[PDB]
Amino acid sequence: DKMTIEVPVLTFVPVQVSAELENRGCWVKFFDKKNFQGDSLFLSGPATLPRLIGPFGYDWENKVRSVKVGPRANLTIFDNHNYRDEDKFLDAGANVANLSKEMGFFDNFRSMVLNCI
Amino acid sequence: DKMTIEVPVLTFVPVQVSAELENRGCWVKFFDKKNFQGDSLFLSGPATLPRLIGPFGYDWENKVRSVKVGPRANLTIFDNHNYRDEDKFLDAGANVANLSKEMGFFDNFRSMVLNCI
Structure with a gap:
């Protein structure tokens, strides 16, 4: 759906502060290891984010x-940059312990849209 | 000054949200270029932060x-990791268009403490 035009900070x-934000419910946590291990x-x-980069x-x-x-x-991830190509949709409460093509997603999604509901 | 023991997120x-935080006043913005240019x-x-890293x-x-x-x-940057060696203190509202030893600072500070007043 249509959303506000801006670049996340x-x-x-x-x-x-993050606890406060987390309580609002509109968030996502990305872990560098499977099973929600490692820093996030x-x-x-x-x-x-048309690209997984930052300042x-x-x-x-x-x-x-x-x-x-x-x-x-609601999280939508894409297989290429700029919300291009195949996409995968993760609904509220989603918990993917193994984000890979074999478990139904991508081995390295390259763009994404996080929307609040 | 004794502060809360925690790792920034x-x-x-x-x-x-960014605007709200900036409004509260306890923030610091680090720029990629001199004179506050580029991304930050x-x-x-x-x-x-004992080290300038992240997830x-x-x-x-x-x-x-x-x-x-x-x-x-209030910002205090250190020349070495883990708040070690020389330090430079910056008062509220302070600005540094050129962060370097020449300008009376460090060429590459490696740890910092951001406290609120």
């Missing part, structure tokens, strides 16, 4: 191995 | 060229 925040990148929705040379393609989607969030 | 937040990393305090292989040492300190923040 990469930011470090205290735990109090947290995204508060909505977020439209200061941040490039996190080929890192995500597992995902958790908030209760009030 | 790397997050992508929507402009609205936004940090909302408090934040204690998913984020490593931003040798990146910050300029800085802006919020109206309600």
Whole structure:
């Protein structure tokens, strides 16, 4: 669906703030290891990313191995950059311990849209 | 100053949330280029970082060229990791168009403490 036009802001925040954001329900957590292990990148929705990059040379393609989607969030991932080609849809509450093509997704999605519901 | 013991959370937040945090005043913006040009990393305090890294292989040492300190923040950067060796303190509202030793700072600070006032 149509969404606000803006570029998500990469930011470090205290735990109090992320907890607050997490409680709102529109979020996603990307883990670098399967089964939600390892450190994770947290995204508060909505977020439209044609490329998995960020300020200061941040490039996190080929890192995500597992995902958790908030209760009030919808996540759409694409196989190529710029929301191009095949897509996969993860509904609220989704928990994918093994984000791979073999488990029904992609081995390395390259763009995404996080929408709040 | 004794602060909360926690690890800052790397997050992508929507402009609205970002604006709210900036409004609270305890923030710092690190720019990729001198004179506040290019993209920047936004940090909302408090934040204690013994290393300039983040989830998913984020490593931003040798990146910050300029800085802006919020109206309600205090920044202290260290020349070495783990808050070691020489330090430079920046008062609230402070700005550094050229972060380097020449300008009386460091060419590549490696740890920092962002406290709120």
